[PDB]
Structure formats: C-alpha cells, structure tokens
C-alpha cells in the first residue's frame, strides 16, 4: 500500500518486540527503508514510547536513524533506514561458527553499543543475536542495536539519580541470554545488559549454551530450569577451552554492584589485548565478508 505519502510498504520481513516490521521504499528520495507498524488501538502504545528513545539516541555511532514516525490510517508507523542481516541470521549463514577473530570484534562494537545507550540513561534488557544488525553499503562492517521495545531509564536525566534497587520482578528479555540476577527477579540494571553480551559472545564460541535443550511442562517451568542450570554452572566449566578473557569477562560483570558504572574500556582492552596475542590482523574483516 502508499503509507506517509511518501512510502510504499513491501512485503513482511520480520517482527521486534510490540509490532510488524515490513520493507518498504521512500519514493520521493530513492531509499529502501524498514517499516514497523502499530496498530493506534490496544491497550498499549509502546511504537511511540520508542521512538523517543530512537531520537535521544540518534547520533550515536551504530543506532538507527528515523526517518519517520508518525501514524496513518490504522497504524502508528516508524520508518527506518534498510539494515542488513541479524548476527544470529550471519551465525547461521557461517555453520554456526565463527572465528575467534570475528568473536573480538563483534565484543568490541557490541560492548561500546551498550555502553552508548547507557551513556544516554537507558538499559537495554533484551541483547541478544537478533537485535544486532550489520549495515549495508559504507556501514556493511558496522553493527547495528536495534529494538527499544524493552528498554527503561536506569538514572534520572537531570540528577543522573539511579533507579532503586527491586526485587520480585518477572524476567524481561529471553531467558537463554538473561542474567542471573534478572531470573532472580532483581530489576535489571547496567551490569545486565554486559552479562548477557557475555552469554551472547560464549554462545558464538560454543554454537549453543547448556542451559540450551532443556524439556520441561509449563512454558515457565523451563526458565526455572535455564534458571538452575545457569546458576549451577560455573563460569570456568561454560569457558573451558576458550581465552580466559572470556570468563574474566564475565566474572567481571557479576562482580559489579546494581547500580555501578561498568568500566567499559576495560572490558574492550581485554579483548584487544587478546586480539593481539593471538596475532590476528586489522583488517576489520568478518567471517561472512569471506562467503564465496
Ligand atoms: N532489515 C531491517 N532493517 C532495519 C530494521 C529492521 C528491524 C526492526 C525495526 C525497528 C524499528 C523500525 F522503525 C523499523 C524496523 N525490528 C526488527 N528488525 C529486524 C530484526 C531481524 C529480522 C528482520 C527484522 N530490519
């Protein structure tokens, strides 16, 4: 169909967290473009919620610029600029194994996305494979964060008071990447997004986790066994026979105190500085760039 006057919506691609996301192009500047829709109806407007964070963090290196937002006929709408393919779609297209080269600098622009939307008050609570995208053209090495659906300010704008600390709460994002104090059902604070980049970085190495596979009855019984496996495997048994950067990783982020600031830097360095000894290049080249 024609929607804002100035796009036609294509055909459906996938979904984020509240809403559908189809292709689309924008006539009148000659750009492919990504189309989430809303319907203005129910119960919960979170397309616009979004947006405003979207805004607040344009400019940041890797976050997707809107082009509009806006909402017409049945539908609250937000135009994106077209990304390329997901990391856990590249993950598949690579065997399910990357190099530890691609592994580095994946934590490299993974950690400093994070760190960026923290930098402007928010927490994540959803990193995961699907919601890191690569670029096309110049931005085809470039990763991209994507999906505001559940994200929440963690420190006020003006005082930069943090949130207080909260108990009892029900888990936010997907159970296999969560932390383990988001299972035990403490509010998810900066520490978390880093924890779960840890799991999403060893599910790289190891192509699956062990809290992976697990049968159960309920659809909520499950995450009691992810739950119990996560907390009854330690850190040096999911790492064994990878870098020790990777545990120091993260024993590093459950180390870190509910509302401490990460250090963000170190993290990056102790990547970088596995980069080097293991004599890989600088030619910014990932596994899939090597696809013939
Ligand atoms: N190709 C492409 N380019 C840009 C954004 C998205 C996109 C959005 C998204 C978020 C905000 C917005 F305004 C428009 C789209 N939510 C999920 N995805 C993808 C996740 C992986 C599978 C395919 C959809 N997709």
Same mark, same amino acid.
């Given at each position: ?18 809403? &559908? ?34 805004? #607040? ?50 934590? &490299?622009? #993974? ?22 995208? #690569? ?20 420190? &006020? ?136």
């Amino acid at each position: 169909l024609r929607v804002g006057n100035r796009y036609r919506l294509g055909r459906k691609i996938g979904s984020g967290s509240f809403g &559908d996301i189809y292709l689309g192009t924008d006539i009148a500047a000659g750009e492919e473009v990504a189309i989430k829709l809303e319907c203005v109806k129910t119960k919960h407007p979170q397309l616009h919620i979004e947006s405003k964070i979207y805004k #607040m963090m344009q400019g940041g290196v890797g976050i997707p610029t809107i082009r509009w937002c806006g909402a017409e006929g049945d539908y609250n709408v937000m135009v994106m600029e077209l990304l390329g393919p997901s990391l856990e779609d590249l993950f598949n297209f690579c065997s399910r194994k990357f190099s530890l080269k691609t592994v580095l600098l994946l934590a &490299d622009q #993974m950690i400093s996305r994070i760190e960026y939307i923290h930098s402007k008050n928010f927490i994540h609570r959803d990193v995961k494979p699907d919601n890191f995208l #690569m670029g096309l053209g110049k931005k085809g090495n470039l990763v991209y964060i994507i999906d505001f659906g559940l994200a929440k300010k963690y420190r &006020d704008a003006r005082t930069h008071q943090h949130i207080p600390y909260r108990e009892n709460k029900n888990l936010t994002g997907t159970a296999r990447y969560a932390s383990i104090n988001t299972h035990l059902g403490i509010e998810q604070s900066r520490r978390d997004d880093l924890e779960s980049l840890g799991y999403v970085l060893m599910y790289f190495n190891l192509g699956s986790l062990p809290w992976q596979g697990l049968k159960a009855a309920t659809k909520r019984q499950k995450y009691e066994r992810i739950s119990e496996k996560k907390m009854s495997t330690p850190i040096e048994v999911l790492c064994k026979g990878y870098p020790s950067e990777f545990a120091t990783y993260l024993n590093f982020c459950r180390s870190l105190r509910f509302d401490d600031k990460p250090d963000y830097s170190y993290l990056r360095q102790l990547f970088r500085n596995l980069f080097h000894r293991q004599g890989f290049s600088y030619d910014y080249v990932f596994d899939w760039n090597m696809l013939k």
